[PDB]
Amino acid sequence: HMRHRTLSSSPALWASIPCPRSELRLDLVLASGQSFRWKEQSPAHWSGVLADQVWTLTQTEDQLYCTVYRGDDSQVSRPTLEELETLHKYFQLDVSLAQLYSHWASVDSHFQRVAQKFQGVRLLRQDPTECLFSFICSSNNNIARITGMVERLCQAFGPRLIQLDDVTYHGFPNLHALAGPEAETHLRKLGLGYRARYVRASAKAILEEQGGPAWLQQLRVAPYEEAHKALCTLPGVGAKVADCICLMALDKPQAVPVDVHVWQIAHRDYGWHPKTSQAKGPSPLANKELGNFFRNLWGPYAGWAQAVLFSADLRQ
Ligand SMILES: Nc1cccc2c1[nH]c(=O)n2C1CCN(C(=O)Nc2ccc(I)cc2)CC1
Ligand code: NI
Protein backbone atom coordinates (compact mmCIF):
# COMPACT_ATOMS: atom_id res chain seq x y z
CA HIS A 1 0.00 0.00 0.00
CA MET A 2 2.63 2.55 1.14
CA ARG A 3 5.91 2.98 -0.76
CA HIS A 4 9.64 3.67 -0.13
CA ARG A 5 10.45 7.37 -0.39
CA THR A 6 13.11 9.03 -2.51
CA LEU A 7 14.26 12.67 -2.45
CA SER A 8 12.64 13.23 -5.88
CA SER A 9 9.29 11.54 -5.09
CA SER A 10 8.29 13.19 -1.80
CA PRO A 11 10.79 16.02 -0.98
CA ALA A 12 8.52 17.61 1.68
CA LEU A 13 8.88 14.71 4.17
CA TRP A 14 12.72 14.82 4.44
CA ALA A 15 15.11 16.69 6.75
CA SER A 16 18.86 17.37 6.59
CA ILE A 17 21.85 17.28 8.95
CA PRO A 18 25.06 19.18 8.09
CA CYS A 19 27.38 16.28 7.30
CA PRO A 20 30.30 16.27 4.82
CA ARG A 21 31.01 13.26 2.60
CA SER A 22 34.46 12.96 4.27
CA GLU A 23 32.83 12.48 7.71
CA LEU A 24 30.31 9.87 6.41
CA ARG A 25 29.79 7.67 3.34
CA LEU A 26 26.54 5.72 3.81
CA ASP A 27 27.45 3.28 1.00
CA LEU A 28 30.69 2.36 2.88
CA VAL A 29 29.12 2.20 6.40
CA LEU A 30 25.61 0.71 6.17
CA ALA A 31 26.78 -2.40 4.24
CA SER A 32 30.24 -2.99 5.84
CA GLY A 33 29.19 -5.78 8.25
CA GLN A 34 28.46 -3.57 11.28
CA SER A 35 24.66 -3.49 11.02
CA PHE A 36 22.80 -6.03 8.87
CA ARG A 37 19.48 -4.13 8.76
CA TRP A 38 20.03 -1.54 5.99
CA LYS A 39 19.31 -2.02 2.30
CA GLU A 40 19.70 0.19 -0.77
CA GLN A 41 16.01 -0.17 -1.79
CA SER A 42 16.50 2.46 -4.52
CA PRO A 43 19.80 3.99 -5.77
CA ALA A 44 21.54 6.16 -3.12
CA HIS A 45 18.71 5.54 -0.60
CA TRP A 46 19.31 3.26 2.35
CA SER A 47 16.26 2.07 4.24
CA GLY A 48 16.37 0.34 7.60
CA VAL A 49 14.83 0.06 11.06
CA LEU A 50 16.20 1.80 14.15
CA ALA A 51 14.50 1.73 17.57
CA ASP A 52 10.99 0.67 16.46
CA GLN A 53 10.95 3.12 13.51
CA VAL A 54 11.91 2.85 9.84
CA TRP A 55 14.20 5.44 8.22
CA THR A 56 15.41 6.14 4.71
CA LEU A 57 18.77 7.91 4.36
CA THR A 58 20.44 9.62 1.41
CA GLN A 59 23.20 12.25 1.09
CA THR A 60 24.80 14.96 -1.04
CA GLU A 61 28.45 16.12 -0.80
CA ASP A 62 27.71 18.16 2.38
CA GLN A 63 24.21 17.22 3.71
CA LEU A 64 22.67 14.04 5.19
CA TYR A 65 19.00 13.83 4.15
CA CYS A 66 16.74 11.60 6.27
CA THR A 67 13.01 10.77 6.59
CA VAL A 68 10.93 8.77 9.12
CA TYR A 69 7.99 6.35 8.81
CA ARG A 70 6.05 5.83 12.10
CA GLY A 71 4.14 2.71 10.91
CA ASP A 72 0.92 3.03 12.93
CA ASP A 73 -1.88 4.95 11.15
CA SER A 74 -0.46 8.46 11.63
CA GLN A 75 -0.19 11.66 9.60
CA VAL A 76 3.11 11.40 7.66
CA SER A 77 5.67 14.14 8.47
CA ARG A 78 9.35 15.17 8.65
CA PRO A 79 11.83 13.96 11.32
CA THR A 80 11.49 15.76 14.69
CA LEU A 81 14.34 17.36 16.68
CA GLU A 82 14.70 14.40 19.08
CA GLU A 83 14.64 11.93 16.15
CA LEU A 84 17.53 13.83 14.52
CA GLU A 85 19.50 13.49 17.81
CA THR A 86 18.93 9.71 17.67
CA LEU A 87 20.40 9.68 14.16
CA HIS A 88 23.23 12.04 15.21
CA LYS A 89 24.15 9.69 18.10
CA TYR A 90 23.82 6.61 15.83
CA PHE A 91 26.59 7.87 13.51
CA GLN A 92 28.56 9.41 16.46
CA LEU A 93 28.94 12.68 14.52
CA ASP A 94 30.30 14.56 17.58
CA VAL A 95 33.62 12.78 16.95
CA SER A 96 35.64 14.23 14.06
CA LEU A 97 36.63 11.35 11.78
CA ALA A 98 38.92 13.61 9.68
CA GLN A 99 41.17 14.27 12.69
CA LEU A 100 41.17 10.53 13.54
CA TYR A 101 42.08 9.52 9.98
CA SER A 102 45.13 11.83 9.98
CA HIS A 103 46.16 10.65 13.47
CA TRP A 104 46.11 6.97 12.38
CA ALA A 105 47.74 7.95 9.07
CA SER A 106 50.67 9.66 10.86
CA VAL A 107 51.96 6.28 12.18
CA ASP A 108 50.51 3.94 9.52
CA SER A 109 51.62 4.20 5.89
CA HIS A 110 49.23 1.39 4.89
CA PHE A 111 46.20 3.14 6.38
CA GLN A 112 47.25 6.34 4.58
CA ARG A 113 46.90 4.59 1.18
CA VAL A 114 43.52 3.03 2.03
CA ALA A 115 42.26 6.33 3.53
CA GLN A 116 42.59 8.05 0.10
CA LYS A 117 39.83 5.95 -1.49
CA PHE A 118 37.78 5.05 1.63
CA GLN A 119 36.75 8.20 3.51
CA GLY A 120 33.78 8.56 5.85
CA VAL A 121 33.89 5.00 7.24
CA ARG A 122 32.67 5.43 10.84
CA LEU A 123 31.44 3.23 13.66
CA LEU A 124 27.71 3.04 14.26
CA ARG A 125 26.47 3.20 17.85
CA GLN A 126 24.10 0.21 17.79
CA ASP A 127 21.64 -1.08 20.37
CA PRO A 128 23.41 -3.68 22.58
CA THR A 129 20.74 -6.40 22.23
CA GLU A 130 20.50 -6.17 18.43
CA CYS A 131 24.30 -6.17 18.14
CA LEU A 132 24.75 -9.16 20.47
CA PHE A 133 22.42 -11.56 18.62
CA SER A 134 23.43 -10.32 15.15
CA PHE A 135 27.05 -11.22 15.97
CA ILE A 136 26.06 -14.60 17.46
CA CYS A 137 24.68 -15.17 13.92
CA SER A 138 28.01 -13.99 12.40
CA SER A 139 30.21 -16.99 13.30
CA ASN A 140 31.53 -18.80 10.19
CA ASN A 141 29.18 -16.70 8.06
CA ASN A 142 28.99 -13.92 5.42
CA ILE A 143 27.09 -10.62 5.20
CA ALA A 144 24.38 -12.01 2.88
CA ARG A 145 23.59 -15.05 5.04
CA ILE A 146 23.81 -13.03 8.28
CA THR A 147 21.45 -10.39 6.82
CA GLY A 148 18.95 -13.17 6.03
CA MET A 149 19.06 -14.82 9.47
CA VAL A 150 18.56 -11.48 11.26
CA GLU A 151 15.74 -10.45 8.87
CA ARG A 152 13.88 -13.75 9.39
CA LEU A 153 14.53 -13.65 13.17
CA CYS A 154 12.95 -10.18 13.47
CA GLN A 155 9.93 -11.21 11.33
CA ALA A 156 9.30 -14.31 13.50
CA PHE A 157 9.96 -12.80 16.97
CA GLY A 158 9.82 -9.00 16.63
CA PRO A 159 6.89 -6.56 16.49
CA ARG A 160 5.82 -5.42 13.00
CA LEU A 161 6.35 -1.73 12.24
CA ILE A 162 5.24 -1.07 8.63
CA GLN A 163 5.18 -2.40 5.07
CA LEU A 164 6.80 -0.47 2.20
CA ASP A 165 6.38 -2.14 -1.23
CA ASP A 166 6.91 -5.92 -0.61
CA VAL A 167 9.27 -5.31 2.37
CA THR A 168 7.69 -5.78 5.82
CA TYR A 169 9.68 -4.10 8.64
CA HIS A 170 10.00 -5.56 12.17
CA GLY A 171 11.65 -4.18 15.34
CA PHE A 172 14.30 -6.29 17.06
CA PRO A 173 12.76 -8.77 19.53
CA ASN A 174 13.02 -8.28 23.28
CA LEU A 175 15.03 -10.88 25.18
CA HIS A 176 11.93 -12.62 26.61
CA ALA A 177 10.79 -13.48 23.05
CA LEU A 178 14.09 -15.20 22.15
CA ALA A 179 14.38 -17.10 25.48
CA GLY A 180 11.18 -19.21 25.22
CA PRO A 181 10.96 -23.05 25.08
CA GLU A 182 10.16 -23.17 21.33
CA ALA A 183 12.71 -20.53 20.21
CA GLU A 184 15.55 -22.96 19.36
CA THR A 185 13.29 -25.17 17.17
CA HIS A 186 11.83 -22.11 15.40
CA LEU A 187 15.27 -20.52 14.85
CA ARG A 188 16.67 -23.82 13.44
CA LYS A 189 13.76 -23.86 10.98
CA LEU A 190 14.66 -20.26 10.00
CA GLY A 191 18.20 -21.43 8.94
CA LEU A 192 20.50 -20.52 11.87
CA GLY A 193 21.71 -24.11 12.47
CA TYR A 194 23.94 -24.51 15.54
CA ARG A 195 23.68 -20.72 16.13
CA ALA A 196 20.00 -21.22 17.07
CA ARG A 197 21.01 -22.79 20.40
CA TYR A 198 23.33 -19.91 21.39
CA VAL A 199 20.65 -17.29 20.57
CA ARG A 200 18.08 -18.93 22.88
CA ALA A 201 20.69 -19.71 25.52
CA SER A 202 22.13 -16.16 25.65
CA ALA A 203 18.65 -14.58 25.79
CA LYS A 204 17.78 -16.90 28.68
CA ALA A 205 21.15 -16.23 30.38
CA ILE A 206 20.95 -12.40 30.21
CA LEU A 207 17.46 -12.53 31.84
CA GLU A 208 18.08 -15.10 34.58
CA GLU A 209 21.84 -14.84 35.24
CA GLN A 210 22.28 -11.07 34.58
CA GLY A 211 18.84 -9.42 35.04
CA GLY A 212 17.71 -8.30 31.59
CA PRO A 213 18.69 -5.37 29.32
CA ALA A 214 19.79 -3.11 32.20
CA TRP A 215 22.90 -5.34 32.46
CA LEU A 216 23.96 -4.39 28.92
CA GLN A 217 23.57 -0.70 29.84
CA GLN A 218 25.76 -1.35 32.93
CA LEU A 219 28.39 -2.71 30.50
CA ARG A 220 28.15 0.58 28.51
CA VAL A 221 29.52 2.44 31.55
CA ALA A 222 31.78 -0.39 32.81
CA PRO A 223 35.45 -0.42 31.71
CA TYR A 224 36.34 -2.28 28.48
CA GLU A 225 37.97 -5.32 30.11
CA GLU A 226 35.20 -5.88 32.69
CA ALA A 227 32.57 -5.78 29.92
CA HIS A 228 34.53 -8.09 27.59
CA LYS A 229 34.94 -10.67 30.39
CA ALA A 230 31.22 -10.49 31.34
CA LEU A 231 30.02 -10.96 27.75
CA CYS A 232 32.41 -13.95 27.33
CA THR A 233 30.36 -15.84 29.98
CA LEU A 234 27.41 -16.00 27.50
CA PRO A 235 26.62 -19.06 25.28
CA GLY A 236 28.18 -18.54 21.80
CA VAL A 237 29.99 -15.32 22.78
CA GLY A 238 33.79 -15.59 22.63
CA ALA A 239 36.53 -12.96 22.29
CA LYS A 240 35.69 -11.87 18.71
CA VAL A 241 31.91 -11.47 19.33
CA ALA A 242 32.43 -9.87 22.76
CA ASP A 243 34.73 -7.33 21.08
CA CYS A 244 32.29 -6.67 18.23
CA ILE A 245 29.69 -5.79 20.87
CA CYS A 246 32.17 -3.75 22.97
CA LEU A 247 33.19 -1.70 19.94
CA MET A 248 29.79 -1.28 18.31
CA ALA A 249 27.38 -0.91 21.25
CA LEU A 250 29.22 -0.53 24.60
CA ASP A 251 31.23 2.58 23.57
CA LYS A 252 34.69 0.93 23.70
CA PRO A 253 36.55 2.38 20.65
CA GLN A 254 39.76 0.51 21.59
CA ALA A 255 38.12 -2.95 21.09
CA VAL A 256 39.64 -4.77 18.09
CA PRO A 257 37.63 -7.87 17.09
CA VAL A 258 40.20 -10.51 16.11
CA ASP A 259 39.51 -13.50 13.88
CA VAL A 260 40.85 -14.81 10.52
CA HIS A 261 39.87 -11.56 8.70
CA VAL A 262 42.25 -9.18 10.60
CA TRP A 263 44.75 -12.06 10.72
CA GLN A 264 44.92 -12.00 6.93
CA ILE A 265 45.10 -8.16 6.85
CA ALA A 266 47.69 -8.03 9.68
CA HIS A 267 49.96 -10.55 8.01
CA ARG A 268 49.51 -9.57 4.35
CA ASP A 269 49.41 -5.78 4.86
CA TYR A 270 51.54 -5.23 8.06
CA GLY A 271 53.90 -8.23 7.97
CA TRP A 272 52.69 -9.17 11.45
CA HIS A 273 53.49 -12.54 13.00
CA PRO A 274 52.91 -13.60 16.61
CA LYS A 275 56.32 -13.16 18.27
CA THR A 276 55.55 -13.85 21.94
CA SER A 277 53.41 -16.92 21.11
CA GLN A 278 55.10 -20.01 19.59
CA ALA A 279 52.46 -21.31 17.14
CA LYS A 280 52.39 -19.62 13.70
CA GLY A 281 48.56 -19.81 13.32
CA PRO A 282 45.57 -18.33 15.21
CA SER A 283 45.01 -19.12 18.90
CA PRO A 284 43.43 -17.41 21.97
CA LEU A 285 46.81 -16.02 23.08
CA ALA A 286 47.88 -15.02 19.57
CA ASN A 287 44.52 -13.32 18.80
CA LYS A 288 44.87 -11.30 22.02
CA GLU A 289 48.39 -10.18 20.99
CA LEU A 290 47.09 -9.03 17.59
CA GLY A 291 44.47 -6.87 19.33
CA ASN A 292 47.18 -5.28 21.48
CA PHE A 293 49.32 -4.80 18.35
CA PHE A 294 46.61 -2.65 16.76
CA ARG A 295 45.74 -0.71 19.96
CA ASN A 296 49.45 0.01 20.46
CA LEU A 297 49.78 1.14 16.82
CA TRP A 298 46.58 3.21 16.36
CA GLY A 299 45.65 4.25 19.90
CA PRO A 300 42.39 4.22 21.88
CA TYR A 301 40.17 4.48 18.75
CA ALA A 302 41.79 1.32 17.27
CA GLY A 303 38.45 -0.38 16.57
CA TRP A 304 37.31 2.49 14.35
CA ALA A 305 40.52 2.27 12.38
CA GLN A 306 39.86 -1.46 11.89
CA ALA A 307 36.43 -0.67 10.39
CA VAL A 308 38.07 1.45 7.69
CA LEU A 309 40.32 -1.45 6.66
CA PHE A 310 37.40 -3.93 6.83
CA SER A 311 35.25 -1.60 4.72
CA ALA A 312 38.13 -1.49 2.20
CA ASP A 313 38.66 -5.29 2.32
CA LEU A 314 34.94 -5.87 1.52
CA ARG A 315 35.08 -3.64 -1.61
CA GLN A 316 37.28 -5.83 -3.91
N1 LIG B 1 36.79 -10.04 3.87
C1 LIG B 1 36.10 -9.62 5.06
C2 LIG B 1 36.72 -8.73 5.95
C3 LIG B 1 36.04 -8.32 7.11
C4 LIG B 1 34.75 -8.79 7.40
C5 LIG B 1 34.11 -9.70 6.50
C6 LIG B 1 34.79 -10.11 5.34
N2 LIG B 1 33.94 -11.01 4.62
C7 LIG B 1 32.74 -11.15 5.35
O1 LIG B 1 31.81 -11.85 4.99
N3 LIG B 1 32.81 -10.37 6.53
C8 LIG B 1 31.71 -10.25 7.52
C9 LIG B 1 32.45 -11.17 8.51
C10 LIG B 1 31.80 -11.23 9.92
N4 LIG B 1 31.49 -9.84 10.17
C11 LIG B 1 32.34 -8.92 10.87
O2 LIG B 1 33.34 -9.34 11.41
N5 LIG B 1 31.93 -7.54 10.99
C12 LIG B 1 32.76 -6.59 11.64
C13 LIG B 1 33.54 -6.84 12.77
C14 LIG B 1 34.37 -5.83 13.24
C15 LIG B 1 34.41 -4.60 12.57
I1 LIG B 1 35.68 -3.10 13.29
C16 LIG B 1 33.65 -4.35 11.44
C17 LIG B 1 32.84 -5.36 10.96
C18 LIG B 1 30.33 -9.40 9.43
C19 LIG B 1 31.02 -9.04 8.12
NI1 NI C 1 54.85 -14.22 6.81
Side-chain angles (χ1 to χ4, degrees), residues 267-268 271-273 280:
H267 181 249
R268 192 193 55 236
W272 189 88
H273 306 75
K280 301 288 298 192

Side-chain angles (χ1 to χ4, degrees), residues 1-6 9-10 13-14 41-43 47 54 56 67-69 76 162-167 169:
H1 295 258
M2 301 190 180
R3 177 151 193 195
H4 285 295
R5 299 165 193 169
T6 46
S9 293
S10 49
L13 298 163
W14 295 77
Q41 292 298 158
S42 62
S47 286
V54 182
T56 307
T67 183
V68 186
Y69 314 77
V76 298
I162 188 159
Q163 189 171 21
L164 307 166
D165 302 11
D166 301 310
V167 183
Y169 284 101

Side-chain angles (χ1 to χ4, degrees), residues 39-307:
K39 294 191 182 187
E40 197 166 21
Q41 292 298 158
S42 62
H45 287 76
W46 296 82
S47 286
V49 28
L50 185 52
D52 312 302
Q53 290 187 338
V54 182
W55 291 76
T56 307
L57 304 180
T58 184
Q59 59 174 357
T60 57
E61 290 302 322
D62 62 341
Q63 294 292 309
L64 175 60
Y65 293 96
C66 53
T67 183
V68 186
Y69 314 77
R70 283 104 191 167
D72 295 319
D73 292 17
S74 304
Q75 189 169 310
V76 298
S77 68
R78 292 176 290 281
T80 67
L81 197 72
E82 296 170 31
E83 290 174 312
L84 287 176
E85 280 178 41
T86 289
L87 201 65
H88 202 257
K89 193 69 174 178
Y90 186 66
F91 292 107
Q92 316 192 74
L93 292 167
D94 280 352
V95 171
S96 170
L97 194 71
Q99 293 172 31
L100 285 171
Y101 267 50
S102 61
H103 184 60
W104 301 319
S106 76
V107 304
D108 194 351
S109 48
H110 182 268
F111 182 85
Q112 197 193 75
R113 292 210 282 286
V114 178
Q116 293 291 271
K117 298 177 180 171
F118 294 94
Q119 296 183 50
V121 181
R122 40 176 56 248
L123 258 283
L124 305 170
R125 193 174 179 284
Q126 298 175 47
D127 167 80
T129 298
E130 185 162 333
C131 187
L132 191 144
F133 296 101
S134 295
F135 279 92
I136 287 167
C137 301
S138 70
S139 64
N140 303 303
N141 219 351
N142 64 55
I143 289 174
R145 288 177 61 202
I146 292 160
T147 303
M149 291 169 185
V150 170
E151 190 178 348
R152 295 193 291 283
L153 177 147
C154 296
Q155 190 188 205
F157 291 84
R160 186 213 191 250
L161 304 177
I162 188 159
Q163 189 171 21
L164 307 166
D165 302 11
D166 301 310
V167 183
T168 305
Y169 284 101
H170 285 249
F172 203 82
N174 61 46
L175 292 159
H176 180 82
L178 301 168
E182 299 302 311
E184 196 176 331
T185 315
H186 199 158
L187 290 162
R188 280 185 177 282
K189 197 172 151 76
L190 298 170
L192 281 67
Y194 72 88
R195 302 173 194 79
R197 184 184 284 102
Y198 301 141
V199 169
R200 164 157 197 277
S202 287
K204 191 163 179 186
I206 297 166
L207 270 38
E208 290 162 2
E209 308 302 316
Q210 310 293 330
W215 180 64
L216 297 170
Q217 193 59 32
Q218 295 159 44
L219 304 186
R220 247 176 195 174
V221 295
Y224 162 45
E225 298 86 359
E226 188 192 291
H228 192 271
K229 191 220 279 289
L231 292 167
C232 285
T233 72
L234 300 170
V237 180
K240 135 82 179 201
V241 172
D243 274 318
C244 289
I245 299 156
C246 284
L247 179 57
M248 299 168 170
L250 314 181
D251 299 311
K252 321 294 193 228
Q254 76 277 35
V256 173
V258 175
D259 64 5
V260 76
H261 299 290
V262 282
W263 256 83
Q264 178 60 14
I265 291 164
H267 181 249
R268 192 193 55 236
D269 310 337
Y270 295 77
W272 189 88
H273 306 75
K275 186 193 159 158
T276 60
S277 201
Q278 295 185 336
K280 301 288 298 192
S283 68
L285 201 67
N287 293 337
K288 197 188 185 205
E289 192 192 348
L290 185 46
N292 298 333
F293 172 77
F294 282 117
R295 268 182 293 284
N296 185 84
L297 177 60
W298 290 325
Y301 276 76
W304 292 44
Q306 191 185 327

